[PDB]
């Protein structure tokens, strides 16, 4: 449950990448995605911006992920523990399912 | 804009590791701020992994990303100067200039910024204007000094 | 040789040197929370849900970034670790929208 | 005839060039061979611009000088021989007052020596300790002498410096580094800048001695880029020392070599920590890492690195010239020597002070500090910067040393001591310190990134009159959890102002929660402006000065302030000639 | 005499007062006991040991000796944790089951 006194920053994001879906609200700042994309893939298409509450993981120069050096490998998707980084839908209409 | 000067600078620095900080300091010294074109031209021709240079530029408490006025105002907001009434001085500056901290004047002659501490706590409250310090400040005094500068 | 054997949560385990206590507990089926841990890259130490109580150390040690020694006593469900994880998860839930 | 001018970062703030060139111009207008020398702040920044004139063996200081005053000084004393007694506060026969109770070791040459010339430093027994250590004594003996002197780190932690030096020495590696932490980001703390602008040569000598002790050949000074005079004087110092074979290759004919470089920091408070400073020095984002490995084993670029703040490196040459037993004679049995303190706040005599540890804090505020400004009552004193604590009036006799002030909930920090009178509220000060911590957090771990903001929200709610019942309980549990969960010392010592100001001023929080009244009359939301009907007579002078017109009433009749309309600006009490506007 | 020698080597009386019933009476009972050299040597050897075990053969040891060994382990705080305690070997295969 949430109280109105504390603030959760609500985003108006728009990243229409055909394969990768990002949602900064569900991020827990574990840093696994940027660490993998830098130390394994080596593209470094994403990075940290800001300090404190303003810390947010976003692509190079705040550009869309399509305009940067992304490979669409999907490792950042596969190492994320929450729903912030998601892979897109292969089926006709994807669903939360086991 | 002047990518050619960004050029002698990057030529000079291409070598030592950990030179991102120095490169950004010289870029700020040349331009007065960091435009996106300069950050792009630095993220190229010496790599440093374009996301990384932006992330370093944002953090580091000092890299101004916007143009400023002719005179840069640095109000002291340290503990000693806040104890002696820095808030009244800041409200006086905000009222007399019509701008908030982090903003510049419409004609671009004054800009308001916040600093950690002047270090001249014996003269608290203190302000810096283009490297000239004014201490033991009352709101009437800062008003008079800004009319004198204007 | 000279089996590195540890005692965690009251049980006796045989392990391999150079690992992490988190890896050993996963090997022997003991659940320790973790969010910023991946065995294929360097430890980060951000979340803090992997803290365990090791005898001889006055402060909590992170099981994702410590190496197993011979004859160390580890407790993963003491009151201090439980309240630390509860506080961390309460702070994480204070910004998560979905 | 010789004259020193006390320029600095504080001399510019009041006078500065306005004095010196005028004096220089006067010299050029008179042609007398007068040695006009630039010197740093002595320590009495409540009288600056400091000027010293030496008539033979007599020293005259009649400071607080402008250009007209400087011309008067030149026409009266340096030519006519007549001192201006209406401006004199210190002479040779009547000197160190505030300085009488001070034992100056790291501040021995501040305000005395031209920092831009090495000859004055050599004339004041400088670089003799370096020569002694190089020519007469072994690095193991150097660490032994440091241990015998009982040197503790002059930073927040107070770690034994000899332990760090020995650990760096035993570390395996062909290349080692010595890094001086000149990046102090504490508000109200300016000992580093004063030392750098007054005596950089002491810092260089101490760093060279440490490099010889450990075996390092490369030095680094991580100084802030916002101290331009300090970096200019450091550049002059390294140039002068290289030209005199004091630093570089084959120092004074010995096979040992040592060089240093200056790195300009970006001004991050988190870089005060060792690993974050290492990350900043390597040109990355300053963020603390996991210990172990310690910097003494694997620090700068993976090489062993010894990191100490400027004050210890300044203290090292004095103890090397005088012996470790001499330095051990000062201080206590657990804290030996002397410490520098940046004394400011609601005080009469502010500036940089130097005291041996074991002295009571009452002596510091009253004997040297001159008491409270405007003769008000002493209420509290903040120590250790915004990560420190607020010592109340009931603990005014606590001796200043690491363990004693640690027992009171505060810390040493870099040495910033701020005096607080009864007119300043502790809730607002805790909010201020927590806001500073929130602004300077690097946002890596959950606790410092989130909980500090949550506690800041709670303090903002209390200070705006929206504090609810149970806010104190939430504050103390959040503080304990943040202290127990943070990675580095920034988040661990972050709730120190919040907890300590609870433990000694809880009633104020109650007064802020259940009463919506601030006793110190500082929180403008919590202020209430009323008009005494007995002691003012219907002039409408306050109401005319209120563009909000929250004051109603007839002429020659008592007026009533509308609390629902009042924006609490204060203009309706400043113009009151009968002083009947009560602030409750 | 072994118990008295262990007591004279500086045991923590507060913890054994909190966790045991009747410690003061036992201490009063051993007030006039003299200590021999061999007993002192064995007590020192047991005291400096960080993780000492006691293996008692049930076939050749009376029950009161087992009780006195348990007292020695309790008052020194070397029981109730890993690598420290009393190991008791039984006479038959399923004596513990019986
Ligand atoms: S898809 Fe691959 S390359 Fe693109 S951001 Fe994720 S990890 Fe980096
Ligand atoms: S892996 Fe997911 S949760 Fe972790 S930092 Fe990246 S986006 Fe956030
Ligand atoms: S399932 Fe997980 S990621 Fe999705 S909304 Fe719930 S907490 Fe967030
Ligand atoms: S405690 Fe604060 S400053 Fe230290 S690592 Fe965590 S977030 Fe960063
Ligand atoms: S304090 Fe200011 S707003 Fe309030 S009544 Fe007086 S003039 Fe008006
Ligand atoms: S200015 Fe003072 S005396 Fe005059 S009306 Fe106001 S409160 Fe009364
Ligand atoms: S902190 Fe304000 S002048 Fe030093
Ligand atoms: S799993 Fe995050 S600190 Fe170890
Ligand atoms: S310049 Fe003011 S005290 Fe040093
Ligand atoms: Zn208040």
Author numbering:
A (entry chain F): 587 to 684
B (entry chain D): 18 to 167
C (entry chain F): 1 to 98
D (entry chain E): 1 to 584
E (entry chain L): 880 to 977
What does the paper say about this structure?
Here, we present the single-particle cryo-EM structure of the Stn family transhydrogenase from the acetogenic bacterium Sporomusa ovata and functionally dissect its electron transfer pathway. Stn forms a tetramer consisting of functional heterotrimeric StnABC complexes. Our findings demonstrate that the StnAB subunits assume the structural and functional role of a bifurcating module, homologous to the HydBC core of the electron-bifurcating HydABC complex. Moreover, StnC contains a NuoG-like domain and a GltD-like NADPH binding domain that resembles the NfnB subunit of the NfnAB complex.
One state is the isolated or purified state of the enzyme in the absence of any added substrates (NADPH, NAD+, and Fd) and cofactor (FMN), referred to as StnABCS1 state hereafter. After 2D classification, the best particles were used for 3D reconstruction with applied D2 symmetry, where they were refined to obtain a global resolution of 3.2 Å for the StnABCS1 and 3.0 Å for the StnABCS2 state of the complex. In the structure of the StnABCS1 state, only FAD was present in the StnC subunit but no FMN could be observed in the binding cavity of the StnB subunit. As expected, the StnABCS1 state of the enzyme was found to contain only FAD in StnC subunit, whereas the StnB subunit lacked an FMN despite being homologous to the HydB from the HydABC complex. We reasoned that FMN is only loosely bound in StnB and only a fraction of the protein complex harboured FMN during the protein purification. Therefore, the electron density for FMN was averaged out within the density for the StnABCS1 structure. The [4Fe4S]-cluster C7 next to FAD has an unusual ligand sphere where three cysteine residues along with a lysine residue (K170) seem to coordinate the metals in the [4Fe4S]-cluster in the StnABCS1 state of the enzyme. In StnC we now observe in our structure that either a lysine or a cysteine residue coordinates the proximal [4Fe4S]-cluster in the StnABCS1 or StnABCS2 state, respectively. However, they differ in the occupancy of substrates and cofactors.
